[model samples]
Target: LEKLGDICFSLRYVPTAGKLTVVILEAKNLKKMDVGGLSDPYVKIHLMQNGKRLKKKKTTIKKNTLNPYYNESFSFEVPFEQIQKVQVVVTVLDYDKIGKNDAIGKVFVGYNSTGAELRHWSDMLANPRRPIAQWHTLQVEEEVDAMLA
Candidate 1:
């Protein structure tokens, strides 16, 4: 089966611990799918901080496994004091039944912080780009005001 588009994964960022928790979304009975008849799939998880790739981890789908449902997860500890923003990238590896491995289904992990006041998941999904201006503005103002004084 060919997977496409963004696969939504749940994530949480704990400010106190400066860590990001990630959970993979799973589908049942994936082992029944004709991987040999179809194609082998590979999975990868990456941590992005401030629009840069920080770290990455990858796994392969074992052939003939009874339960193909992948409930995989990874966690990253970041220097929260330095981080302006963070994002997780999940990619599906595409392998031809005949030969060669390609990549597909590039997805991003949608995350919400503990203090986020939003009520809808869509709000979290829409704003992958963090507002660095707001954070910097406060700091800049503090410095400017101190200089003026």
Candidate 2:
């Protein structure tokens, strides 16, 4: 199967403050989407419930590179009681100054997600306040939408 790229990120949940922080650590070998043989990349983070998005956040753009290192974090208010029912969807995009940005790929993690995704989510719940880092190969948006549905 073909993949657009790989992303490394960490998830941490704080019970006392009901904060869930997702850190966009870095990305590797992202798809080149610009004429310069590189991409201006950034990330879009979504906090979802079932198939609907509840909150959204984004990371800063990294210019002209396939391996962009983005050590930025975004937080969402997710109470302990609501944590199990929530999921996160992260989309990596190639920023285009003149037109619509291209979506490189996406990674989604939740209780319903399988393999490394599920494991990462479980780890966050099991060890509260400590960020659990994982690397996920990106997948097509349509496929992920199916998973979300």
Candidate 3:
């Protein structure tokens, strides 16, 4: 199965200042993408608008673990009115020293997204200044890559 794992994170939107903060907390039961049944994992955070990248941030690599703890936060500026026009894409990757980094999985959240992803986004929007945390089942990278197409 290509179902990689689960990502645990939180979102906080402050309408007063047009600030949106994303906290990448951790991932669990991730697919092992390396030898010895382990992986060096890291997270890539993307802010996208209309299929275009607006900003990107990443978490530090956590070596040799399928389950990694990130505890990293990234912020974006999106005006209240512009909230519906953007989304957050979270990609977990397996780091490689001599080869290309392999994407493990991804999850996106926004008005256009459905299920738990949309619910998490809606929760943040409805509760200003309050962080809403949730666990999302990671999808195959190719699935979410289409959203940017």
Candidate 4:
């Protein structure tokens, strides 16, 4: 995502339980000296599961503002029966500009019991709010189990 002046960009992703997925957010055109001149862009991620909305979380877009890159990822078990659906919405705010100063992207990932579990996990982890430590723990456990198999 790129903004001509001071701008913000965001992306959202949703995934089902026991599935693995990856969502990538990239910013281009950021330069060294340009960092302080522009307002720091804010990245937020929200999760919608079982008709309930998870708390919205904020993420940093970094300084130098030019060509900044931030990615939110997840991998864990989701209760399929309890969880109905998932939705992700990304919003970017342009601090400098008042109108037409932001960009947003949304991705919805559905789930099916017969589908690939890893893909779902990757998708679920793609958002920023996911706890990395918890996901890593689950990932290690899965790896060990796979190796034993």
Candidate 5:
């Protein structure tokens, strides 16, 4: 069963003082990674600026399930000027037993991002009050590595 899941997330650009970005997401129906049972998963969100990581935030671990609902929300106090070059890297990870976490999939959203990824971000920026939600497909770690080459 090589079925990896789709991630659902929404973004809200709170321009109250014109310097806020908020995001909320829930991971539903993830791929089964555990050989014997369901997998425990979590999410890691990173704010990258200028191709380098500036800040990172993560959600609590959801234990023993392929479908993890991480209704997590976060805010960033960044000005419009700085948020332009910021890229959001959202990654889903499977918590392992006695080793490193396995990456189930990931999505990149930012100014430099393309396709629906770009649309999701651009839409939110174009209208702060209008929330943008997207479901991103997860790629294998190796595939992502080669693409970065």
Candidate 6:
């Protein structure tokens, strides 16, 4: 989602029924990306597979807060089944009044995003129906040239 809160969500393969539920509690220490030194923040949750979008979700805008809190929640149907291939795209964006909204950061969990995301998923898997949470640092996107040159 245009987000990650303090946690991921209810896991699966437990409680006799598999319902993937997650709650987005809040976010702190978010970077500012506006001339006013503040950004209206928002979140988008995207689920994708095979480079094609499977599902998408979002949160309401929190105006002008460097550190914003959104107690939002979502469910991924048959979540345990979809997780393996679905790309969990958590994006935090600056809500601009004009022009395109600038991106604060993003994490592609379905792909290889490094430690935190994988752990988020694995822990959820290990304890089905248990909600797992962690404070994730938003990752700024880098230019392709930076890595290539």
TM-score per candidate, in order?
A: 0.53, 0.95, 0.97, 0.37, 0.84, 0.77
| C-alpha lDDT score of every prediction, in listed order | 0.44, 0.91, 0.92, 0.36, 0.74, 0.63
Score residue 98 of candidate 4 by CA lDDT: 38
Better of 3 and 4 by lDDT: 3
Model 5, 1-149: lDDT tens per residue? 33677778888776665444445467767877788667888888877766566778888888888778777887667676666677777788998868999899877777667778888888888887677777877666575444333
Clashes of 2: 0
**Model with the higher TM-score, candidate 3 or 4:** 3
Q: Candidate 5 — which pairs collide?
A: none
- Per residue, candidate 4 scores C-alpha lDDT tens digits across 23-91 of 335544422232356534544444545445554555555533544556654332435443334443233
Give me candidate 2's TM-score against the actual structure: 0.95
The model with the greatest TM-score is 3
lDDT of 5 at 96: 83
By the TM-score metric, which is better: model 1 or model 5? Answer: 5
After superposition, candidate 4 runs with Cα above 4 Å error = 1-25, 29-39, 49-52, 64-66, 72-77, 82-84, 94-149
Candidate 1 local lDDT, 1-149, one digit each (tens): 33232233455555566665555554222222344544355567776654557798766574443223455666778655633355555555544566555554444432322222122223433443221111000112233223222
Report the C-alpha lDDT of model 2 over 44-145, residue by residue, as the tens digit: 999999789888999999999999998998899988898998889999999998889879999899858888898889999999889999999899888888
> Between 1 and 6, whose TM-score is larger?
6
TM-score quality measure for candidate 3: 0.97
Better of 2 and 3 by TM-score: 3
Q: Pick the lDDT winner.
A: 3
Per-candidate clash tally? 0, 0, 0, 19, 0, 5
Over the stretch 1-149, how does candidate 3's per-residue lDDT look in tens digits?
A: 56699999999999989999999999999999997899999999999998898899999999999999999999999999999779899999999998999999999999589999999998988899999999999998788888665
The TM-score between candidate 1 and the true structure equals 0.53
Ranking by lDDT: 3, 2, 5, 6, 1, 4
- Model 3 per-residue lDDT at 112: 84
Residue 76 in model 6: lDDT: 64
